[PDB]
Structure 1
Amino acid sequence: HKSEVAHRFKDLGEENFKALVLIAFAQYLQQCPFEDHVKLVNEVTEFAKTCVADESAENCDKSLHTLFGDKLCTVATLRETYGEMADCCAKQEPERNECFLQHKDDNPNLPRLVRPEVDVMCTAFHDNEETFLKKYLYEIARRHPYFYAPELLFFAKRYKAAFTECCQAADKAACLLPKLDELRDEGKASSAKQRLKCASLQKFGERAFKAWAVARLSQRFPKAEFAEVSKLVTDLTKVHTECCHGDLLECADDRADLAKYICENQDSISSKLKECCEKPLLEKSHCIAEVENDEMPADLPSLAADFVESKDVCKNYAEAKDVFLGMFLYEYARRHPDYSVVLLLRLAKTYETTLEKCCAAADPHECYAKVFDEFKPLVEEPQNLIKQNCELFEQLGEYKFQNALLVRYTKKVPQVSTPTLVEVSRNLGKVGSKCCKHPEAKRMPCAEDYLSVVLNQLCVLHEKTPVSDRVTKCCTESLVNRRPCFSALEVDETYVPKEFNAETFTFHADICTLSEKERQIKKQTALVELVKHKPKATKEQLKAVMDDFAAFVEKCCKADDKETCFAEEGKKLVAASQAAL
């Protein structure tokens, strides 16, 4: 490979190349119009083709990093539009590159993207499909500059699948909107999982991250030995350390070099990898990250022998504290894919601290004899929360379960703004739906993945706009305890009930005409303010109020003369409730 741009053109193919160069350029030049990018992207593709034809052609032996930067600096309004960024063009090539990385804006000043109508979309996607998908690719890329480029492309292909199906059906929107709903949420949850790996590698260090990865990998590849699991985690840490630094090309070669290792050492790792390992370069590492947990060797002993019973437990511990603890995590993790990673790290930390104490008594073996009884209540604490919430979710539907939850977290942190308590509680609802539809031995990992998502969003909405000490505690706490901390918030008895307001509890005929979506946000915003008004309110009482409201709204949506009902009855509701309390 004399020429890096030719080689890489051949292994992606023309179509994937153009789109990734679009995304790559969209992510730096976040203010130049869509049409400039089509010009850059055409020019660069013309140029790659040169190097496919003849690898000794002009400039083809320049590396990708030299090419990318040369191209940004040919931009005319770069001084005018980008300011500081134009100063990077005046340096040498081992500094120019890392200067462009430092001057990437995160979350610019762009207007938020309004999703157009189902018929305008289907028409546009019909009329010109490539300029419809790339403009929207360019649109989402410029707004999310730290979103890893080929996953953005992976999400783009799913967007394309959605339209190709549901625009070719005679009632388009009933098909289409529930698909675009999923993608919005999957894609934004992708953006925030990416956000979480980099913050925690920084915040919590490289040892925590490795503990987390040994755990996940051993649940994924229970038939691999500790040596190979150790060797996988070592190169991931390097990969994610290298990816979080932000240089796309450097990140992508790191992920490609591990994927290619995983597929050549496939018999040493897992039997579930054949399908992913026959994938084209671009899809490979994505596929490997998503592949399902292999089955654990059937003839597996107790952990008691190596980690409790044996002599040479403290001797093996002291010889290499972290190696010993990583063997524990591994062995415990590979017997329990039913656990969340976090609970496994709670158990590894529990074993850790007993040894610190017990290996430095005059008698260790009797001190830690009982260490496994200390796993009992840590195991059961997330199981009983999943038992309890999901049994509840089985009684009330999703919607009433979101309202069950809304009263719950409004009484614990009433100082939060009403729109936040709504977004978080409806969000939690959907993690109710999905995860309580799984079997017991597969629930705890579901909820872990979705809560970490919902709880990280929560915990920057909060560092932006703080409110409660207690919620600041959970957010600046260990990712290990972040969730139990939140589960341990009790009702706020320091809360002073807020001043009554009618406008809050006034309702106009517009409730009948809104969609179930926004019907529900309205009813729930009022539910929050209702509990904010009278926080010390019982849930026999609260059921009664909700009951009268249900009858009230239907009464006025099921009567001739709609608005006069709403004012007439609504006055009767507010006062009735104000005394029913």
Structure 2
Amino acid sequence: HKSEVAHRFKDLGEENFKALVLIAFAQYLQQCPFEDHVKLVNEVTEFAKTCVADESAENCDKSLHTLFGDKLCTVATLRETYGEMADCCAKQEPERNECFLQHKDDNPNLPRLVRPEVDVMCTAFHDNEETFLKKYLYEIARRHPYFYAPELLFFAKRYKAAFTECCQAADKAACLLPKLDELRDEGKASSAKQRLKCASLQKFGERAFKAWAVAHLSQRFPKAEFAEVSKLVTDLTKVHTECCHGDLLECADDRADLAKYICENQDSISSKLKECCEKPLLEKSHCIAEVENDEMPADLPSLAADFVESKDVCKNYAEAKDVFLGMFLYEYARRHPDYSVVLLLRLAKTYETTLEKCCAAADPHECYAKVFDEFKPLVEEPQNLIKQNCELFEQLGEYKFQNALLVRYTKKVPQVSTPTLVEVSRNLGKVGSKCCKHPEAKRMPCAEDYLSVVLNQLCVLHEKTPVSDRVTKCCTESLVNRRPCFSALEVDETYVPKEFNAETFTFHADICTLSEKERQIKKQTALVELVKHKPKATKEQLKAVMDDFAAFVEKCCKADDKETCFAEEGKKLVAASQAALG
């Protein structure tokens, strides 16, 4: 009431408070050393406590934004280190704060953070647990200035948890490594999705975003009333706009409020929101965002009734087009938790194009009467791709399955870089093992989820170093045609093969002493290079060469003479393979 600091402190807790103030300052002062931030934190915490003791103590009446800027402008090397950002201190709130956001480098130049040795980490953890964790919290925060702090805190705790369960294990590494790898990928996925939603909100605008949300929200709260789903979509759109602007405090309050609204109207939204709503402030939002779908009414009518059979469908559509179409989505989405959001968007879009070119004819009721018949092929395209790809992934394993995609895409866009093809193919292979293990009912939503970051990752790279108009075409089409576009790419007939290169196909006995991750990437790299040299090769001709190669390695990484074997037998493979592939 009288003191925000005092208040946030009381219901956030000392520990969470100290850690968030740390992440907050590291995201602006990305250049100050660790021991400098630790001091700031302690000082702010000391302040907070003074206010808890007495709401009226000096300065406790001021706003968090104001206290934040005042403290930020206290750094004596501000102008010398950050330069232009110091000029912000000459302004007044909201301008000052507004000025600080602008001068926050989204991608600073800091060395990549390397992962030390399990023993080195575990001993550091043991000795001084807090500094070990806070120093890494600091290193991650300054590198990801836009990552929602509370979310970064949630990750820190999963990290602490892994060091507790693995450093006391007989085989530490066997325990820790696979956990760290999973956290990293999950951390990277969360980040990509975060900056992806803000990008879309910018390019395509509110309407398309609201569309996306309606479908999404009604798949999870199928029992909610449309007016409820609209209310939430409105607020959810306000929250994302605010959070994307980058203002941590504003973003936080809007999320708290929305989490508050939801729990209070719980029975009217979903039955699966119990746990989430009994959780502490800091977690409510996060929990709710990951909540599972409630179950649908089962006593639901049929779409064709109100959207195809009704005679005054155009009368309702002309009165308020977006609301009606919004109704369509809501109706269609909550009967299909198994459709990907884009699929539902693709349907609404198609329904829209019909109402437009039908409500402007003599007899409307017979112009659009066959709409649902046009949904069939849209629905089946994504499904058939799943079964066809998940089947193939069963035959081969994650590794061989990746080799197939590799051959398939290299032929699609040979122009693309070998290391990029390998990376994309490896991720697509993962998505296959992460989503095919689910029952048909959850596959499509899963694939949509993983394919969106992977395809946006792809487009970004091609954004920097464009190499194909086709990839750029698919990359600049709507977020609803993005995937169908890539799925429609065909073999590159125009492509002219690369000239042979002995070097590129010469293997020394180093691959013998390499890890699984190294051997594969080394084989997969050669494979792509193989396709780029002879693009007209058959799956047969190819499978044959890979066959000679498989053994070839074994026969040199199991012989009394490493290098010699690899150079003698290697000369024989290259020559024999060249003649095979003509």
TM-score of the pair, normalised by structure 2: 0.99
Question: What is the distance in 2 between the residues matched to 1:246 and 1:494?
Answer: 46
> Displacement, 1:113?
0.8
**Any idea what the Cα deviations from partners look like across 1:461-485, whole Å, max 9, x if unmatched?**
1111111001011111100111000
C-alpha root-mean-square deviation of aligned residues, in Å?
Answer: 0.7
Question: What is the distance in 1 between the residues matched to 2:176 and 2:9?
Answer: 34
**Any idea what the Cα deviations from partners look like across 1:209-248, whole Å, max 9, x if unmatched?**
0000000000000000101000000001011011111100
> Displacement, 1:493?
1.1
> Displacement, 1:563?
1.0
Question: What is the distance in 2 between the residues matched to 1:325 and 1:468?
Answer: 36
> Displacement, 1:11?
1.1
**Any idea what the Cα deviations from partners look like across 1:317-367, whole Å, max 9, x if unmatched?**
111000000000001000000000000000000100000001111111101
Question: What is the distance in 1 between the residues matched to 2:164 and 2:126?
Answer: 9
Between 331-340 and 500-509, report the one with greater CA deviation. Answer: 500-509
**Any idea what the Cα deviations from partners look like across 1:95-141, whole Å, max 9, x if unmatched?**
00000000000111101011111111111111111111111110011
**Any idea what the Cα deviations from partners look like across 1:132-176, whole Å, max 9, x if unmatched?**
111111001111111111111111111111111111101011111
Question: What is the distance in 1 between the residues matched to 2:500 and 2:35?
Answer: 54
| DSSP-derived class of the 2:170 partner | coil
Question: What is the distance in 2 between the residues matched to 1:149 and 1:186?
Answer: 16
**Any idea what the Cα deviations from partners look like across 1:511-568, whole Å, max 9, x if unmatched?**
0111001111111111111111111111101100100000000101111111111111
Question: What is the distance in 1 between the residues matched to 2:140 and 2:59?
Answer: 32
Question: What is the distance in 2 between the residues matched to 1:332 and 1:14?
Answer: 47
Question: How many residues end up aligned between the 2 structures?
Answer: 581
Question: What is the distance in 2 between the residues matched to 1:201 and 1:439?
Answer: 32
> Displacement, 1:89?
0.4
Question: 1:462-541 residue pairs with structure 2 within 5 A?
Answer: 462-541=462-541
Question: What is the distance in 2 between the residues matched to 1:503 and 1:57?
Answer: 74
**Any idea what the Cα deviations from partners look like across 1:486-513, whole Å, max 9, x if unmatched?**
1011011121111211111111111011
Question: 1:26-41 residue pairs with structure 2 within 5 A?
Answer: 26-41=26-41
Q: Are residue 212 (structure 1) and residue 181 (structure 2) matched?
A: no
Question: What is the distance in 2 between the residues matched to 1:516 and 1:44?
Answer: 49
Between 173-182 and 338-347, report the one with greater CA deviation. Answer: 173-182
Question: What is the distance in 2 between the residues matched to 1:327 and 1:551?
Answer: 60
**Any idea what the Cα deviations from partners look like across 1:16-68, whole Å, max 9, x if unmatched?**
11111111111010011011010101110111011111110011111110011
Question: What is the distance in 1 between the residues matched to 2:45 and 2:290?
Answer: 31
Question: 1:81-92 residue pairs with structure 2 within 5 A?
Answer: 81-92=81-92
Q: 2:230 maps to what in 1?
A: 230
Question: What is the distance in 2 between the residues matched to 1:495 and 1:302?
Answer: 51
| DSSP-derived class of the 2:569 partner | helix
Unaligned 5+ runs, structure 1: none
> Displacement, 1:308?
0.2
TM-score of the pair, normalised by structure 1: 0.99
Question: What is the distance in 2 between the residues matched to 1:61 and 1:537?
Answer: 75
Q: 2:79 maps to what in 1?
A: 79
| DSSP-derived class of the 2:27 partner | helix
**Any idea what the Cα deviations from partners look like across 1:417-452, whole Å, max 9, x if unmatched?**
111111111011110001000000110000000000
> Displacement, 1:12?
1.0
**Any idea what the Cα deviations from partners look like across 1:355-395, whole Å, max 9, x if unmatched?**
00011111111011100011100000000000101000000
> Displacement, 1:573?
1.0
> Displacement, 1:302?
1.2
Q: 2:322 maps to what in 1?
A: 322
Question: What is the distance in 2 between the residues matched to 1:237 and 1:118?
Answer: 43
Question: What is the distance in 2 between the residues matched to 1:542 and 1:124?
Answer: 50
Unaligned 5+ runs, structure 2: none
> Displacement, 1:397?
0.3
Question: What is the distance in 2 between the residues matched to 1:454 and 1:574?
Answer: 35
Question: What is the distance in 1 between the residues matched to 2:530 and 2:423?
Answer: 17
| DSSP-derived class of the 2:555 partner | helix
Question: What is the distance in 2 between the residues matched to 1:5 and 1:79?
Answer: 27
How much identity, in percent, do the aligned residues show? 100
Question: What is the distance in 1 between the residues matched to 2:170 and 2:265?
Answer: 49
